[PDB]
Amino acid sequence: SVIEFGKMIQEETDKNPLTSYSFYGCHCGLGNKGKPKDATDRCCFVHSCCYAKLSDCSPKTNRYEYHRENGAIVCGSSTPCKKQICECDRAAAICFRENLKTYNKKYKVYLRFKCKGVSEKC
């Protein structure tokens, strides 16, 4: 669920997830239209696609377990849905971390009417 995703983000990037990732660019949080602003915004866009595919899994509220094996996130649930949503979250957190080098503070709480273009296809 959003609780696990939230933990994951903070563990992987050391950033406050609400301030740093919930209003970023065009696709983080609730945003969903426009061409993504940069790599970070793109992590948001693929994470949304990942959740779209798993609509029958209640990605936002569905709780799951995860742990680490030498620092790596391992999704640890048996329920196919819990495994899958976790995979989405995991890939996103790693994506955020792998792209901290281009994180742009100017996009933190981006004015969404500025979002132009069509995003890629999921």
UniProtKB/Swiss-Prot annotation:
Pfam name, any one: Phospholip_A2_1
Tissue: Expressed by the venom gland.
Outcome after substituting N32G: Enzymatically active in presence of calcium with increased toxicity
Taxonomy, superkingdom: Eukaryota
Region ranges (Important for membrane-damaging activities in eukaryotes and bacteria): 105-117
Keyword Disulfide bond attributed: yes
GO MF term (any one): toxin activity
Disulfide bridges in this chain: C26-C115, C28-C44, C43-C95, C49-C122, C50-C88, C57-C81, C75-C86
Chief location of this protein within or outside the cell: secreted
Coiled coil stretches, renumbered: none
GO CC, one annotated term: extracellular region
Any single GO BP term: arachidonate secretion
Subcellular location as annotated: Secreted
Keywords: Disulfide bond, Myotoxin, Neurotoxin, Presynaptic neurotoxin, Secreted, Signal, Toxin
Family note: Belongs to the phospholipase A2 family. Group II subfamily. S49 sub-subfamily.
Functional summary from the UniProt entry: Snake venom phospholipase A2 homolog that lacks enzymatic activity. Is very active in inducing myonecrosis in vivo and shows a potent calcium-independent membrane-damaging activity in vitro, most probably by binding and incorporating in the membrane. Also acts as a presynaptic neurotoxin. A model of myotoxic mechanism has been proposed: an apo Lys49-PLA2 is activated by the entrance of a hydrophobic molecule (e.g. fatty acid) at the hydrophobic channel of the protein leading to a reorientation of a monomer.
PANTHER family (UniProt xref): PHOSPHOLIPASE A2 FAMILY MEMBER (PTHR11716), PHOSPHOLIPASE A2, MEMBRANE ASSOCIATED (PTHR11716:SF9)
UniProt name for this protein: Basic phospholipase A2 homolog ammodytin L
Origin organism lineage: Eukaryota, Metazoa, Chordata, Craniata, Vertebrata
